[model samples]
Target: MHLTPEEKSAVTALWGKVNVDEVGGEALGRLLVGYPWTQRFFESFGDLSTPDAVMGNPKVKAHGKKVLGAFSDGLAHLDNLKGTFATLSELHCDKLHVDPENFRLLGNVLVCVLAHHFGKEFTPPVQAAYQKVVAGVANALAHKYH
Candidate 1:
């Protein structure tokens, strides 16, 4: 649940270039489409009846930005991941009963989005550092279960 000093630097460097709105929306849109079963958790969102609809839905875009915001905040508050996401963890696990597996899925989905967009700067080591960030995020989001 920790990133080393050098890992932190790498994450900070790459995240600085990210466009949260665009990348986040695409990441989540692909997540719902790639894993159609995930749509159940988002049934309350509008127009998810088609993949194209999910891509265009405003709610999905908002939620995506929120999700990525949490992740980027993880970069900011690296020392307080679990505490930062405590309320969200409560809602997802206690209220919605979300599977922790989905946290990991979205974690990797963000990776795909990053690789697709930043293929040049997202080198192997950089990808590794970013993966650790996502892993820590997934851990934080699932903290309520334990």
Candidate 2:
């Protein structure tokens, strides 16, 4: 869905408050904790048996930052989501073999994080905008796998 100018501005402003390292690390921690099976894809992250271990690992932190950076870049190019998704789909679906379901799970976790991070500023309209953004990412990623 297309985000209105106000929606785009709101999302960008909210995203600015996010510390990519902190939020990404926390999101990864939540993913591993909530869905342990996904850890197989992240073998490079040392021990994925514990959230503490994964979150503390420098490699995991770096990877988390990279993921966040990609998401940030995607936001910057909302007008060209198709191209962004094409690249991401190849990386995740073909090369990385990341389970498509993980994207949906991650999106949910991210929305929760945004809600907490943005607090009252994450009004209904803001949440709607973010949901549409996440849905667009999910749809494009899913297109590659299914």
Candidate 3:
């Protein structure tokens, strides 16, 4: 998918308003809350049942920043997303052993969160841009699995 300059700027601008720590926390919280079974992937969180505990944990916070930071980096380098996403795909799929489905799930949750956060500003075009980026990343992550 090709991202027009406007689309790229729109996404990056919207992302700029986002508090990486807060959004990351909420996104991960949603993942754990919505998919309880996925909690096993985060054994370091201690008690996944307690959302606050997980959100408050330093490790979780750092990890959340890392994930969100990677996303931001990807957005910044959309021109070379294949290379950027390939590294992420390898780390997540080969090193981390993450299920490809989880990437899709995260994308879905991220869109929802962005919608809620941006409210009316989350226009159709903006949504489309995010969907494209998210799908691209998900597809990249799924490449090795497939």
Candidate 4:
């Protein structure tokens, strides 16, 4: 899962604007844990044991769980925001369908969330590696709905 130079640069640029000594570290710890739930559900899902095994790996699992819990809380916040926006939009117009938008929306959201949360003091190499992992997971899901 090696990242390209361009990807590394993009990540470095994004991270350089953040304040690491503050809220960055703890936020990152949470995001790391929650990402794999994407791979677990959409990618190489054979018997569901793979994610189970990942969860069993005490270190990765622990971090992953904490991230996931935080993500759930974050999602609740998003949902509330969405509700407010939807209500306002509906008042002026009509309701929109959300059923089929999850795949693309979630993918975009995950990438942005990870980059934003973990962008504090991450080096180019580390950011590149993270991008590689994320791109791989996304590519793996290419055939899921087909």
lDDT of each: 0.88, 0.80, 0.80, 0.41
**TM per model?**
0.92, 0.87, 0.87, 0.28
Q: Is candidate 1 or candidate 2 better by TM-score?
A: 1
User: Taking the tens digit of each residue's C-alpha lDDT, what string does model 3 give over 1-20?
Assistant: 48888888888888889998
Put down candidate 2 lDDT per residue, 51-109, tens digits, no spaces. Answer: 67776877777777787878877888888777778877877877888878888888888
Q: TM-score winner among the candidates?
A: 1
Alpha carbon lDDT at 45, candidate 2:
65
The candidate that wins on lDDT is 1
> Which stretches of candidate 3 lie above 4 Å from their native place?
none
Please, what's the RMSD in Å of model 2? 1.8
Better of 2 and 4 by TM-score: 2
On residues 1-146, what C-alpha lDDT tens digit does candidate 4 reach at each position? Answer: 24456664564465454443323333333333444443433233233234445434444434444533433332233323233234333432333322223334344444555565666555555555545544443333332232
Off by over 4 Å in 4: 1-108
Clashing pairs in 3: none
Q: What is the C-alpha RMSD of each candidate to the true structure, in Å?
A: 1.4, 1.8, 1.9, 15.7
In candidate 2, where is summed lDDT lowest over 10 consecutive residues? 137-146
Per-residue alpha-carbon lDDT of candidate 1 for residues 1-146, written as tens digits (9 for 90 to 100): 56788888898988899999999899999999999999988888977888899999999999999988877877788888889888989998888888999999988998999999987888999999888888888988898885
Better lDDT candidate (3, 4): 3
Q: Please give the lDDT score at residue 53 for candidate 4.
A: 51
Task: At residue 58, give the lDDT of candidate 2.
Answer: 77
Instruction: Rank candidates, TM-score, best first.
Output: 1, 2, 3, 4
